[PDB]
Design a binder for this molecule. Sequence first.
Ligand SMILES: Cc1cc2nc3c(=O)[nH]c(=O)nc-3n(C[C@H](O)[C@H](O)[C@H](O)COP(=O)(O)OP(=O)(O)OC[C@H]3O[C@@H](n4cnc5c(N)ncnc54)[C@H](O)[C@@H]3O)c2cc1C
Ligand SMILES: Cc1cc2nc3c(=O)[nH]c(=O)nc-3n(C[C@H](O)[C@H](O)[C@H](O)COP(=O)(O)OP(=O)(O)OC[C@H]3O[C@@H](n4cnc5c(N)ncnc54)[C@H](O)[C@@H]3O)c2cc1C
Lengths: 581, 583
Amino acid sequence: PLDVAIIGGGVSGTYSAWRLQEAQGDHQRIQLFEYSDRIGGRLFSINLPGLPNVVAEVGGMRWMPATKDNTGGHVMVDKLVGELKLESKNFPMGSNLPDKDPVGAKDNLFYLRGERFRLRDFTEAPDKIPYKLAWSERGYGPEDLQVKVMHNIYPGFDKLSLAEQMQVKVFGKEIWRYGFWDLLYRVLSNEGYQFMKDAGYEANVANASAVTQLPATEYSDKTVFLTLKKGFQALPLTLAKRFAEVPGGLIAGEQRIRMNRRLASVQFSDDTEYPYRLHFQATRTVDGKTSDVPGAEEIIHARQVILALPRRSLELIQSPLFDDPWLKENIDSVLVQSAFKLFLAYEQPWWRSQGLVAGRSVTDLPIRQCYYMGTECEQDGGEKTLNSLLMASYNDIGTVPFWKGLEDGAPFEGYQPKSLQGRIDANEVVPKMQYQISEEMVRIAQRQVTSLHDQIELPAPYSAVYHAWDADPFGGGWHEWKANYRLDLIIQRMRHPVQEQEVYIVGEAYSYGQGWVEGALTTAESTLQDFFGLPRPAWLPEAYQLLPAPAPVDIDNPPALACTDCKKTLTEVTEFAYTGI
Amino acid sequence: QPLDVAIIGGGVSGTYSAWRLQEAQGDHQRIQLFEYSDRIGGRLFSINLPGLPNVVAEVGGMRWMPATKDNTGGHVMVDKLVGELKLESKNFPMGSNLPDKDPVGAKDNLFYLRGERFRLRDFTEAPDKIPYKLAWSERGYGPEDLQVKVMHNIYPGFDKLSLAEQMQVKVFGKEIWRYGFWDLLYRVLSNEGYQFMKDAGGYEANVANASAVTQLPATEYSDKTVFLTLKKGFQALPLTLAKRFAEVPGGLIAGEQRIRMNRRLASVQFSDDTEYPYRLHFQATRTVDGKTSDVPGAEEIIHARQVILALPRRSLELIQSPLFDDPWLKENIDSVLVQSAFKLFLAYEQPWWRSQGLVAGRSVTDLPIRQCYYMGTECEQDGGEKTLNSLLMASYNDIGTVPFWKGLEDGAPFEGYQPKSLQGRIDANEVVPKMQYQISEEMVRIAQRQVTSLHDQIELPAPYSAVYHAWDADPFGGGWHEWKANYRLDLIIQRMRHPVQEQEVYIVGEAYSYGQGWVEGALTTAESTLQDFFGLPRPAWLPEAYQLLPAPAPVDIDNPPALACTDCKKTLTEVTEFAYTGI
Ligand SMILES: Cc1cc2nc3c(=O)[nH]c(=O)nc-3n(C[C@H](O)[C@H](O)[C@H](O)COP(=O)(O)OP(=O)(O)OC[C@H]3O[C@@H](n4cnc5c(N)ncnc54)[C@H](O)[C@@H]3O)c2cc1C
Ligand SMILES: Cc1cc2nc3c(=O)[nH]c(=O)nc-3n(C[C@H](O)[C@H](O)[C@H](O)COP(=O)(O)OP(=O)(O)OC[C@H]3O[C@@H](n4cnc5c(N)ncnc54)[C@H](O)[C@@H]3O)c2cc1C
């Protein structure tokens, strides 16, 4: 049988397991179940040929470290990597060249409405921006314009607590009853509305609750970001290994994890002890592509279930539990957004020849978002080769676009790099992913990159990797709270969605840090404390609030928000306006 | 007693299906139509907003292309049954008839893209005003005109080829149907000229990446193209059918039991009756003010010889049956992209647009309304009221989800205001119709706000009535269907009439027709099934000239014989003169 049946080989599920077994594994039977042959889930890191030291993270890349106060930042991720003694690098968003005056990303590229400019042109030469925006909006970068909108709406939102940010109202409605665009088109011009869009991930928020998506002003090159050296996927992997490595235990390391298992159902049994018939199902991973194996059955019993799952995953499992109208109505509370990623690998970082180093360039061409990821010979004690990496698609948007189109015709073989002419074969240069990139896609993707960089012919790529997250079991890669949904409360309850039942969900989807690993961890850690009873770890400060304090249930006519330092705020809000004037 | 046939779904497809049958093989077999709701007509919906009793606000279907004199072209099926069932037809105007001397048509209709205002004429009159970086070659063509330049640029005459030949036309070493629509255009157009067409042309945010073989000869929507909507509203046809069905004298079953509404099919099952291998387990469904929800009661089971499913994609997807397990039918129900449809109507006591030299047609914008249509004025209608009450239709965007027309569906409801023209004739609680969806005090205010801007106005007269509707809800989960790419529509158009042969189940609907988003598409699919699989003949009102469905190319599109071109001496000549227009 089973006491604790964790379902999810993600940061959530890998974290859930480690903590418990490394605590009460000797006193409890704990088994993590995964649907693929890979631990990591939406975390995924691959080194490509020629680039042993340039990690192509198909999943999560960066986290925001903790502060001194250890109240701000992605504390859980910075400190967990702490205890797990995994290595960190500064995930670079701009140029540190020159070091007299780093041009950050100021000199990074922009290519909208068939006109090229820079991030510095926004402020330095707003005539160059080809958006007929209003006079009040002219002279702000888009990241700076978001903050204008916020304060316009209310000064200080950012510094409010979710509890308070829920009582905040705009033009009559609470702000969380506004989609992110049903707001923008009321406080911005349509030429500001269309603008921000084109120049965010078109998706951006697809009308995500405005209380979450408004203070999204940490995309700056001014904020810090750290990446795992061995790839982000090394955290959930290292979480799995240490799970089995627990000396001692009612179950043995070897039989502690169970891969290629798709939990198809959670039927209710009489067995008081284990009242959950967990109908799993065998699968097979053939070059990442996971597909069912017949035979049916595999009915393990459990006392407690932990679903380290996203929404679709929870959609797909059949239970009567889900027929509980709260869970039925609030499973919908979030929004699957499909994410798309395309890496291209050159013997050359040709971008360095045109001022660009790291960060991102944006365009109205289907590639939308090119990133500059690094060169091998640069990477600390790496191989001595100018082989460098370009994550030229970040584009995420639902439905059938141009990325979910050209992924057919003929596959891409590439070419063998000099470096690898005495080391690897041309049948392995382009790796074997769940999604095999085409000759076609790469040709066009190259054609687009070249236009973005205002060149005529760029050095061709040898290796590349397409991926996508529009496929079950994920539906999408990121989740975003819908409008008219009390995210404040759902964050608290989704952990124990029905009281009577010992069924638990934990993930980035039903967390405050949505589209972050910090989200998945927090939900996990908060739930192990408030329910499973595990005490707060040593590496996790007393300070760091895991999940934010909600508002009340009655916000029908709340007591007003008593401002404190209104002074500083308005002082600031004005001073901010002179940076566009 | 059991049923020989069960035409499930009361769409224009279903209603046509049961009619002809009973008409012919109805004394010969037990025919019964099954409806989900309190209303026949399906997507075809025709409400008369109060004060506008003669200005039909077709929420669903509206118009149809008249038949040509050779009868091989035009919505032939629709335009001959509109005569046969004898239904009143008026012109659907896309342009202004005034001035009688030199009719401007849609030329003067408005455009507001990228915060700059122009008209359809300003394309061919003064491109200088288009605020798009269209390359030299492309500068000087209207959205319609451009699509045709591209088409031609591909295989000159693509519009002239039968589906068979079209499918075989490759472009840049790929089958045209392997490309989507945009995927193609983002290789023939400048990325502005791409964006530009995505902001104006035909529908709206729609024009989704769909098989190029369907969406490239989609230029029909011009201001030279004639079009007609039924006087009584398009819902008239699939009701006169629904009536006429139960009105056939010769029948085993009387008219009172023939049309069984408020019956939603949940399971098609293989029974034991070797004569009725179809145990249909229905469920009771109640309709209060457009919102039909289930009555848990009891799953009523009726035995059927065959079930002619007149359902679109979700509607089908919603039945639990081992029949959908058939590997073909599993992977060929995803042959079509579901795309939602929204729509707002606003009623005014003055057609303020006339004051601004716009009559009928549409106007395009980078604002969320995206589109807007001027319908008509009650008293302009033939023997209408003596009111200046008029109708503006809109919210005709068309996109996946969470857009900006679903972002204002909540708040408080719009009650409107008793016009002077409906004083003591109807009450301010009854001015704004109660529909499935109730347009909010908020959605009206924003819509109007936006409409104002579109028309470069300071303030417009507030509307008195307003209805919002959507087709993003099951049992449809989408307005109209568009063929995906790397699919063989030609074949599926044939084999969706009978997905499984051994089994006597037939699916009919525009959802898998050539006329997708057209009433023709649903009539055609039904008729060509009645004829082939129910041996019903060509009726008197249908010419033999009109080929119902298009020629399926061979399965061997591997390296077939090359299409011997025709009057190039003509073709290439029309292709070259067509490029002198834009210069
Ligand atoms: C493009 C992209 C970029 C990102 N970048 C960042 C970033 O820079 N920084 C950051 O912090 N975060 C980032 N994220 C977010 C991060 O990758 C995820 O949110 C996180 O990995 C989710 O962890 P989880 O355990 O909650 O869920 P998952 O990792 O999705 O865990 C679900 C697991 O359960 C398995 N499963 C599903 N169904 C079943 C079933 N029926 N039975 C058994 N197992 C099942 C899945 O295969 C998977 O292993 C990014 C995400 C994307 C898509
Ligand atoms: C916004 C819009 C505008 C359009 N404009 C035009 C136009 O201008 N001109 C034109 O020619 N065409 C137009 N069309 C197309 C037109 O609506 C279609 O041709 C037609 O309505 C579809 O007929 P159908 O038989 O395929 O299915 P539908 O008409 O969609 O009928 C489906 C029926 O199935 C029923 N049903 C669903 N589930 C069940 C169940 N479980 N059991 C039983 N019954 C069930 C539904 O209640 C419904 O009655 C438009 C469509 C839309 C969405």
